[PDB]
Enzyme design. Structure first.
Site, PDB file in Angstrom:
ATOM      1  N   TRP A 170       1.091  -1.638   0.107  1.00  0.00           N
ATOM      2  CA  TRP A 170       0.069   0.116   0.099  1.00  0.00           C
ATOM      3  C   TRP A 170       1.238   1.027  -0.664  1.00  0.00           C
ATOM      4  O   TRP A 170       1.681   0.817   1.354  1.00  0.00           O
ATOM      5  CB  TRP A 170      -0.888  -0.439   1.573  1.00  0.00           C
ATOM      6  CG  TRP A 170      -1.833   1.056   1.429  1.00  0.00           C
ATOM      7  CD1 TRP A 170      -2.913   1.320   0.698  1.00  0.00           C
ATOM      8  CD2 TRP A 170      -2.198   1.887   2.916  1.00  0.00           C
ATOM      9  NE1 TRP A 170      -3.489   2.099   1.084  1.00  0.00           N
ATOM     10  CE2 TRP A 170      -3.235   2.296   1.821  1.00  0.00           C
ATOM     11  CE3 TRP A 170      -1.129   2.256   3.964  1.00  0.00           C
ATOM     12  CZ2 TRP A 170      -3.958   4.086   3.027  1.00  0.00           C
ATOM     13  CZ3 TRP A 170      -1.620   2.972   5.182  1.00  0.00           C
ATOM     14  CH2 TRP A 170      -3.225   3.628   4.413  1.00  0.00           C
ATOM     15  N   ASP A 201      -0.933  -5.555   8.940  1.00  0.00           N
ATOM     16  CA  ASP A 201      -1.721  -5.109   8.403  1.00  0.00           C
ATOM     17  C   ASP A 201      -3.238  -4.981   8.310  1.00  0.00           C
ATOM     18  O   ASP A 201      -3.424  -6.107   7.100  1.00  0.00           O
ATOM     19  CB  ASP A 201      -0.727  -3.309   7.738  1.00  0.00           C
ATOM     20  CG  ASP A 201      -2.237  -2.566   6.846  1.00  0.00           C
ATOM     21  OD1 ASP A 201      -3.595  -2.252   7.077  1.00  0.00           O
ATOM     22  OD2 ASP A 201      -2.251  -1.365   5.999  1.00  0.00           O
ATOM     23  N   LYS A 258     -13.721  -0.782   5.183  1.00  0.00           N
ATOM     24  CA  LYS A 258     -13.832  -2.105   3.933  1.00  0.00           C
ATOM     25  C   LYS A 258     -15.834  -2.884   4.230  1.00  0.00           C
ATOM     26  O   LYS A 258     -16.251  -3.096   3.650  1.00  0.00           O
ATOM     27  CB  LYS A 258     -12.775  -2.514   3.206  1.00  0.00           C
ATOM     28  CG  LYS A 258     -12.053  -1.501   2.786  1.00  0.00           C
ATOM     29  CD  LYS A 258     -10.521  -1.619   3.134  1.00  0.00           C
ATOM     30  CE  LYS A 258     -10.047   0.094   2.001  1.00  0.00           C
ATOM     31  NZ  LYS A 258      -8.510  -0.682   2.421  1.00  0.00           N
TER      32      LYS A 258
HETATM   33  C1  PLP Z   1      -7.521   0.924   3.036  1.00  0.00           C
HETATM   34  C2  PLP Z   1      -5.990  -0.345   2.963  1.00  0.00           C
HETATM   35  C3  PLP Z   1      -6.087   0.776   4.577  1.00  0.00           C
HETATM   36  C4  PLP Z   1      -6.259   1.726   4.814  1.00  0.00           C
HETATM   37  O1  PLP Z   1      -7.939   1.720   6.153  1.00  0.00           O
HETATM   38  P1  PLP Z   1      -8.411   2.657   6.791  1.00  0.00           P
HETATM   39  O2  PLP Z   1      -9.775   2.513   7.578  1.00  0.00           O
HETATM   40  O3  PLP Z   1      -9.327   4.010   5.401  1.00  0.00           O
HETATM   41  O4  PLP Z   1      -7.448   3.917   7.815  1.00  0.00           O
HETATM   42  C5  PLP Z   1      -4.349   0.580   5.033  1.00  0.00           C
HETATM   43  N1  PLP Z   1      -4.098  -0.399   5.000  1.00  0.00           N
HETATM   44  C6  PLP Z   1      -4.317  -1.335   3.960  1.00  0.00           C
HETATM   45  C7  PLP Z   1      -3.716  -2.390   2.757  1.00  0.00           C
HETATM   46  C8  PLP Z   1      -5.725  -0.819   2.947  1.00  0.00           C
HETATM   47  O5  PLP Z   1      -6.143  -2.063   1.712  1.00  0.00           O
END
Ligand code: PLP
Ligand code: PLP
EC number: 2.6.1.1
Lengths: 396, 396
Positions: free
Chosen positions: B130, B211, B246
């Site tokens: 990312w 993450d 998401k």
């Molecule tokens: C979407 C995403 C984020 C961000 O998350 P937010 O809740 O929008 O701050 C961080 N890391 C990955 C791999 C993502 O896909």
């Protein structure tokens, strides 16, 4: 990796809220953190807020991400509240605002931005000031220096000491000013004093940073913004970290704004692109709920009329409690004259209690105040006034 | 002070959303940012979410500040989702979680905490990863080093390259792992591969940082957590930055969590006190709305059953679009075999398009993809599939 991490000391304001929670005493009284309470000792969601919330529930069709800087209307309404409707800053497009998570979030974004994009290395904060100012700035790697402010003996703003203290501030340093309702003293400069300050910063080359968290709690929305507006007219540059936590009773939704002002449109847009980069590397984009509630109310005339009255009610209720406090202290034998507190603005009165008296109040009487002696007058009600005043005169 | 600030480059993901906005073309197609779209090309608020929201509207009595770490139940429900209901970490009280503003907020809090409280100076991120990972870590002042990952030629996880690359990582370094549905490749290690990795980190002395932003988008809630759980069983310490943006379609409410795990209860509570101090100096406390929506749904069986089905529908719809994409490319004469994309998990497929093809797609055809060639399959619908596939074969 974590074996040697040493425990952090409790937050002087927020950790106080924990002790009080864990307190099984029946007659315990709050007065610590800066949260408003109505006559019944509750912190209700404002009626204008509940209404805006049904509105959002019926009208929102998506939770898709906001832009880094948030809801545009929120930004516009914020600038009008801060600078005024027909402001030249607004008309010349000299200001850009980013919606942030609370006023604290705005201060941190301002800090990160300054540390990474300017030559700033020093931030001047008043003695005393909100305890968290130091932490936020030190977090971005800036040092905090302090300027004289409060005259503890006369409970006045020691203005010459303030000026002479500030003469050690160099061109290029940041000087932090509280909007109105100074936290923790409630002592604020007069408009004349604000003008003298505005002209001295301009002459000395200081970058003003305003922490405006109590707009509407002293005299009114537009009056409380006079010091900042005095400054806005003289300066080519300034930043404002404002909060809607208190004036909208939206504490936990984290609603604030960081407003960046530069000499022109072109410069401010360029400086703002970096502010946006600092935000992306922090929390990405801001939380929608609280900010859309604020935009909804400020944009709707009926909703706005209701909110303004609710804020007026909070302001007035606090004013009544202040008088009530000094009278009750007097009729309880708190021999010291506490009349200076009538002269303070906002939620707080700086009582002059010592570290140990503040400590005894809690252990022996369960009334919670910040160790600095700062007391939340908005946390006082006609029902708790007497036990509270009784505890105070006993540690005196 | 701002005269020389140079404009920041546009965010490769978020700035893309601006260009597309400013695009007056009629047939423009999104595919850039990681936001789900239903069959109609809209991003609706989930039904379980709308229901939890009425619940909150009727039941909330205050907006008073949450504690620095947020809503307790939110924290508990998060740990169960991450580690499992009867987890030993949970039973031994080895984990503490702080509610944060989105997953990004969790990563930054983790960074600040590590930079200020440990001896960490290096964070290893996958190539590719990312785009915002680098910015967040560099913001806290840590350097980012990169480990091999993707085999562009075979569209596979180049596992030996991953291992041999990681041999340059020292004891005490942080190694970042994506939970499941790797962003941007969609290529993830097998459970066997996760076990090999778990035992190598333990042996090498790396601190794992996960993450986890797509729990539920590959096979299921509990299956998608297998890599992390493999790791949790071997490690005395780890941190998880998770997101509910998401999987709950709560993008703009900023709902995430930073979970800290130490060898014992005593150590983790001590390490957590410092994490809380890093939060206070950043945004103070987290936004209540999104997180209380999440806690409400996870705590209520009826609401939870509805949400799980909604998530299942998102997952399945994306799976259908993937097949649809490779077929349509084939029947449009996209001579290259794009079947490897069926093998990728999550919202994204790493298409293999070059920087210039990605650029032509937009300028000549108005279909927006990230410059790395990453395309949002969740942004595809049966209605835009053909024009989209037509644009692609034309730049090939
Ligand atoms: C979407 C995403 C984020 C961000 O998350 P937010 O809740 O929008 O701050 C961080 N890391 C990955 C791999 C993502 O896909
Ligand atoms: C309350 C307050 C803050 C914090 O605002 P939040 O919106 O709660 O982040 C900052 N500065 C001052 C002077 C305050 O009174």
């Amino acid at each position: 990796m974590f074996e040697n991490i040493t425990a952090a000391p409790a937050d002087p304001i927020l950790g106080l809220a924990d002790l009080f929670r864990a307190d099984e005493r029946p007659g315990k009284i709050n007065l610590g953190i800066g949260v408003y309470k109505d006559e019944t000792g509750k912190t209700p969601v404002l009626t204008s807020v509940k209404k805006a919330e049904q509105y959002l529930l019926e009208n929102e069709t998506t939770k898709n991400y906001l832009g880094i800087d948030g809801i545009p209307e929120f930004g516009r309404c914020t600038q009008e509240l801060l600078f005024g409707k027909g402001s030249a800053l607004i008309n010349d497009k000299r200001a850009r605002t980013a919606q942030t998570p609370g006023g604290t979030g705005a201060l941190r974004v301002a800090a990160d931005f300054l540390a990474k994009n300017t030559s700033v290395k020093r931030v001047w904060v008043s003695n005393p000031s909100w305890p968290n100012h130091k932490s936020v700035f030190n977090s971005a790697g800036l040092e905090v220096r302090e300027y004289a402010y409060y005259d503890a003996e006369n409970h006045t703003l020691d203005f010459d000491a303030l000026i002479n203290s500030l003469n050690e501030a160099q061109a290029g340093d940041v000087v932090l000013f509280h909007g109105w309702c100074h936290n923790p003293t409630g002592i604020d400069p007069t408009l004349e004093q604000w003008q003298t300050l505005a002209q001295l910063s301009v002459e000395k080359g200081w970058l003003p940073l305003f922490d405006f968290a109590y707009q509407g709690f002293a005299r009114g929305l537009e009056e409380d913004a006079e010091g900042l507006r005095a400054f806005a007219a003289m300066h080519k540059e300034l930043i404002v970290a404002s909060s809607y936590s208190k004036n909208f009773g939206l504490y936990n939704e984290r609603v604030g704004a960081c407003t960046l002002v530069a000499a022109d449109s072109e410069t401010v847009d360029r400086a703002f692109s970096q502010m946006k980069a600092a935000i992306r590397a922090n929390y990405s984009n801001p939380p929608a709920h609280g900010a859309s509630v604020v935009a909804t109310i400020l944009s709707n005339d009926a909703l706005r009329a209701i909110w303004e009255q609710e804020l007026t009610d909070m302001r007035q209720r606090i004013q009544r409690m202040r008088q009530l406090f000094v009278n009750t202290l007097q009729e309880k034998g708190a021999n010291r004259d506490f009349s200076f507190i009538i002269k303070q603005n906002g939620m707080f009165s700086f009582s002059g209690l010592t570290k140990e008296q503040v400590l005894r109040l809690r252990e022996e009487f369960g009334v919670y105040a910040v160790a600095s002696g700062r007391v939340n007058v908005a946390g006082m009600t006609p029902d708790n006034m007497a036990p509270l005043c009784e505890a105070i005169v006993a540690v005196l």
